[PDB]
Amino acid sequence: QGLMQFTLPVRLCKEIELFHFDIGPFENMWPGIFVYMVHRSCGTSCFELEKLCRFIMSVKKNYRRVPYHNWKHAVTVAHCMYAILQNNHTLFTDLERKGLLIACLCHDLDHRGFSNSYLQKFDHPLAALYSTSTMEQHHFSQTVSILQLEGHNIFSTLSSSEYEQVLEIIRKAIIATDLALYFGNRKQLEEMYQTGSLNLNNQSHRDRVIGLMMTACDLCSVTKLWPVTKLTANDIYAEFWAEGDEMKKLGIQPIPMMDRDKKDEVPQGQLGFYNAVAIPCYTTLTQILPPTEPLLKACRDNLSQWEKVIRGEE
């Protein structure tokens, strides 16, 4: 380093600070965008440039060429977190700023384009090793593997204590991306917020709140400008419809969300998703972290775009 500040063209320098930023089609700029976010989010001192670059390039190598659960998603989810952390400067610990951008870059490592359900029904070996949150325990496992490669220990300077704390933040953060766990997490956070028992000094409460940030970042396609939201949904459904095909090959009617013959039901399905998952997610997040409100506003804008799709106004 250390006088070696990463800088982005003006349009990117400004728009990267905004929640609805799209990282663009230039794959070779994504590492630099991430380093930029680490430096501003954490410090130019938090990681050794050489180690961080080697870590990033090994993480990229271990995402697959699947339509949605790919390297672009990793960097997209890390950017939403960057926007949360930067809008909530003083709420997060030094270990948290470090751990969470990494947890986001790593959160779908070695994803195969298939749900936990599909793995369980296929009887994949990963389903025997990890009975619940199957892919998420895998993703955390790949994260540790890459951290243990020569020249890849970005945490090398931390004490044995802090190293164990940061790997434990990463683990909880990655596990929280199991959407099956989100519904209960958000219900508890809602009750806590509304009986005024929420306490960010309670580690167990911080864990929940970080879990909600992870869901929020992970679903952030719904918080983009409509053309990004719409074109991202196409990639999401390309994966789901492939899984649906694979379900049919095991002799199992897929759920409609995964059935490409039920394309007509997408718009009504998106309404349910925004109502049951997305809006409640961003609403509770905004309650706990008021500056995240642009995610909720952007989400509601996208619900309204799907309602126009239904009314044939597009």
Ligand X SMILES: Cc1cccc(Oc2nc(N3CCN(c4ccccn4)CC3)nc3[nH]cnc23)c1
Is 69 annotated in some ligand binding site?
yes
Q: Whose Cβ is closer to ligand X: residue 14's or residue 187's?
A: 187
Convert 196-220 to b/e letters by CB count within 10 Å (16 or more is b). Answer: eebeeeeeebbebbbbbbbbbbbbb
* Binding-site partner at residue 96 among Zn ion, Mg ion, ligand X, none, CB < 5 to 8 Å by type: none
Of 310, 299, 255, nearest to 275 (Cα)?
299
**Closest approach of Cβ 90 to Zn ion, in Å?**
28
The answer to whether residue 139 is catalytic is: no
Size of the site for Mg ion (CB under 5 A): 2
Binding Mg ion (rule: CB under 5 A), the pick from 41, 142, 177, 284 is: 177
> CB of 156 within 8 A of CB of 51?
yes
Maximum distance among all alpha carbons in the chain? Answer: 60
Residue 178 binds to Zn ion (criterion: CB under 5 A) = no
DSSP state string for 40-101: HHT-TTSS-HHHHHHHHHHHHHTS---SSSSHHHHHHHHHHHHHHHHHTGGGS-HHHHHHHH
Smallest distance, Mg ion to C-beta of residue 135, A? 6
Instruction: Determine whether the annotation assigns residue 245 to a binding site.
Output: no
Q: Is 107 annotated as a binding residue?
A: yes
Catalytic residue among 20, 69, 111, 152: 69
Torsion of CA 71, 74, 77, 79, to 10 degrees: -80
Phi, psi of 258 (to 5 degrees): -105, 0
Give residues 201-240 in contact with Zn ion (rule: CB under 5 A): 218
Least separation in angstroms between residue 305's CB and ligand X is 12
Q: Is 188 annotated to bind ligand? A: no
Q: In this structure, what token pair is assigned to residue 292?
A: 């995240």
> Closest separation between CB of residue 99 and Mg ion, Å?
17
Give the one residue of 108, 110, 239, 243 binding Mg ion; rule: CB under 5 A: 108
Specify the residue, 177 or 229, whose C-beta has the smaller distance to Mg ion. Answer: 177
Binding site for ligand X (CB under 6 A): 179, 221-222, 233, 236-237, 256-257, 262, 265-266, 269-270, 272-273
Report the C-alpha gap between 136 and 111 in whole angstroms.
9
Catalytically annotated residues: 69
Binding site feature residues = 69, 73, 107-108, 218, 270
Chain contacts with Zn ion (rule: CB under 5 A): 108, 218
Binding interface with Mg ion (CB under 5 A): 108, 177
